[model samples]
Target: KLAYEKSIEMAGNYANQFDAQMEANQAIARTLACTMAEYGSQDREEAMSIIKRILNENPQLIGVYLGYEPDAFDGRDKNYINAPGHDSTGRFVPYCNKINGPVIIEPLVHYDSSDYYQLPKTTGKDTLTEPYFYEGIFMVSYDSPIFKNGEFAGIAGVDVPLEYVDDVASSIRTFDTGYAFMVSNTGIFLSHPTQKNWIGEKSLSDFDVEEIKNAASDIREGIGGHVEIKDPITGKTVIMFYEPVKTGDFSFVLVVPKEEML
Candidate 1:
């Protein structure tokens, strides 16, 4: 009876802690979204300043280069991935291999439908789209807008590798056993505690359990909820908390095991 009572008490405490953490995390996400939007706002002068700094810092690097071309970074054109002047010997030599700067920027300039063009359109408005990828962890390509001549220039964006967000998520704990993670609004896993399988695949179809299905169904309605679910692969019972990204169409969910809560 004592053990049972103790377990119950602990569960209650964990539930409260989890709730508080969810609320706090949701608030943090909102603040992050708002801050990014403000920085990328069309009416904001700071946004222009940032773009100018980027260009000035790396004149040879056109935009992010996500793909490979024979001489993409050779530095020839204003928007070529291998433009001749912006190669390894360019002014911004440090950014030559920097994934976030030249690699991403070059891709944005070339790809008309890249995230850079899409982020600004949905900022402070809608949720991000699907198939988002993170390369070096924590660097995510969300929504962003580019402005030129006092007009909407284009979208500028990148995805922070999962390692970054995972670090933040791992720092959150309710007890020794409790853990945290993040998932897309569509229930797609983003960052996980283990970090090994993080973003290794696409689609939440792998976690095709009834509870997950039910939770996903409520996503579009702006409803957030939790449930005890069995891991399809591990067959372990786990507690999950979910919150909408509230940016475009994505949601963020965190999960931990039931035994750990006690």
Candidate 2:
């Protein structure tokens, strides 16, 4: 039989692997953003002509153009933008319009004029900025800035659906019948292996054991390591690997049934 300490150590190793992969991806994304910005700056006319030019020239870049305004408008007759497969409806309509251009799609929640102009001034480098909480989705916007005549015009960006990212949380595999999932520092399930019920739901702090809750609360400052937890739904003993988000100080918790590991 494996000792609990040994099992915990193993889980920590796995969590480290996941965290490393996520960090690598983040680095890649930053590099891509920088490279694209440099290329677009040199070729301004080709970059900002219109949505049609992009789609026509690059047929492979299908889902990156929106013809109308980038921000969400009010009123019942508001003609909002949409992605390819989805329809324009209420708040459910996809906030991102186009993915081509320097900045791609902007989510309606954080794409207001106030946040829009403030982005360039606030950050050292061109970055994606958007509010990330709503319903069960954690939406992140991707944008490359459009500069005209030495002035910041607007962002040509896109919205990256966190719902799809949550799917990545649910897919982490385990060898010892363990389960892997992601959580926010507040103990919300950003992603879970069993996503059917937990998607978009915040983790119940009252239900979490004392040890897990304490670690979760301190997660914003980059908490890691291990703890024992009782499965909220099953009431079974489990070992959890807790990893915090480097970019936004979120947390990812992976749990494995003790019995399965033994």
Candidate 3:
């Protein structure tokens, strides 16, 4: 009971934190979208300025990037604005860090589809993306769509570190062999102990265990629930506690080996 409670609280707080960061990112994206609608992407200076300002103001945010609908920036050009990072030839990635200052890292590599284009194109409004290997680091993206005239203009995105939640999840301790972890909105493991390496990889469906399936099904379906799943890796029967990550699609799952709980 005590273990699950702390796990629930951690998951709830983390989910809310996602909302806060994404909300902040969304507010900034909304502002930039309006700015683009008014000023148009002809100069692109305005767009870059907005991104720079947001990155600077929000220390938690990794960095900001935008994707434009082909020619969306054309006051006339008919081709995409070709922002500093989205061009072909893998040139101009434009990543910025505090040490390097908030200046665009001119001519960065192009990240074709996958999460960058795939995310914005697939969804509208705010989205919490799965962790991906980005710029040599495992990261996630908080993408808020930018629309113009009822059409998809592009996306204003904040790249966030996935490991930021590691300490929080790893800190979950209960019973002798009990531990806690995080699951994504899609039922993928966000954090885990034995399954830590499976982050961004394994989903509930990946496991052949019945309890795992039922638990994930309930979670993805947005119903709050829990289950007892036998750990496939350790062959340990465990009582698992699960709670939704608040408004997000993820959940906080804490599992305790039967031996420990009993």
Candidate 4:
């Protein structure tokens, strides 16, 4: 109980801090202004250069990109403001992280359906994608709307690693034999002490217990609760505690075996 209470605060704080960083995406918003300016001037080379620089420097980022309406935007087809990791020949895909580095694409199909392209198209303002995995890693994408002549032109943005949340979860330690982990209000695991691979890979339902499913739903709806769960498989009891993340639609779950809580 001692460790569970304090560490849940840290886990929630991690998401809160992420919200602040997302707010700072205004940097990308304003940068889009410059990019659009150069783009309008037909300076594709200078415009594409911005995205390339951001991708290289922010190793923590999965990737970065600028998506514009087909005609109002010069896409990978023109190779403007793309990445060195891939060629922008004809694919109109968003920039992605490759093992070697960031890669932007030039494709003729499948671009409009992507959230990186659609979110800005729909909101016409700064927006973010819900937490998800790309290539087996958990990530959330930040997008800043681009306006040209007071019209929504497109978006400029980056994909950031949710590993910061994972790191925070890993750093949290409680009593001996007790452990802590985290999940989103949506029941996506952000961290799991013993099952490290489960972070971002599993959901509350994966626990295969009705009690856990109910708790996750409650957490998703913004109600907080704590409970003791008895495992039918192991005949062991465990304690589960959850906190609502103060920032977005997320939850922080802390778990400790009953034997250790005493």
In order, the Cα lDDT scores of the candidates are 0.43, 0.48, 0.63, 0.63
User: Over the stretch 154-182, how does candidate 4's per-residue lDDT look in tens digits?
Assistant: 66777777777777676666666655566
Give the poorly placed runs of model 3, Cα more than 4 Å off: 1-31, 74-115, 118-123, 231-236, 258-262
Top candidate by TM-score: 3
User: How many residue pairs clash in all the candidates, one count each?
Assistant: 46, 10, 8, 7
lDDT of 2 at 177: 70
Supply the TM-score for candidate 1.
0.51
TM-score per model over all chains: 0.51, 0.54, 0.75, 0.72
Candidate structures ordered by TM-score, highest first: 3, 4, 2, 1
Return the lDDT, model 2, position 99. Answer: 38
Model 1 segments more than 4 A misplaced = 1-97, 100-110, 118-131, 134-138, 145-153, 156-162, 200-202, 220-222, 230-236, 248-252, 259-262
lDDT of 2: 0.48
Tens digits of lDDT, candidate 2, 1-262: 3555655565456556545644543443344334443443332223334433433443322223211123221222234334332245322122233333443333344333444335643452444333354443355443444443344434443334456545665666555677677665456665666645665455736453687677676664677767777766877887776765554455666676777776
lDDT score for candidate 1 against the true structure: 0.43
Residue 24 Cα positional deviation in candidate 1, in Å, after optimal superposition: 16
Candidate 1 lDDT, 197-244, residue by residue in tens: 646454454555788777676655546566778776887887666555
- Once fitted onto the true fold, the runs of candidate 2 whose alpha carbons sit more than 4 angstroms away are 1-45, 49-110, 113-138, 142-158, 163-168, 171-176, 204-209, 230-235
Please give the RMSD to the true structure for each candidate, in Å.
9.6, 8.5, 4.4, 4.5
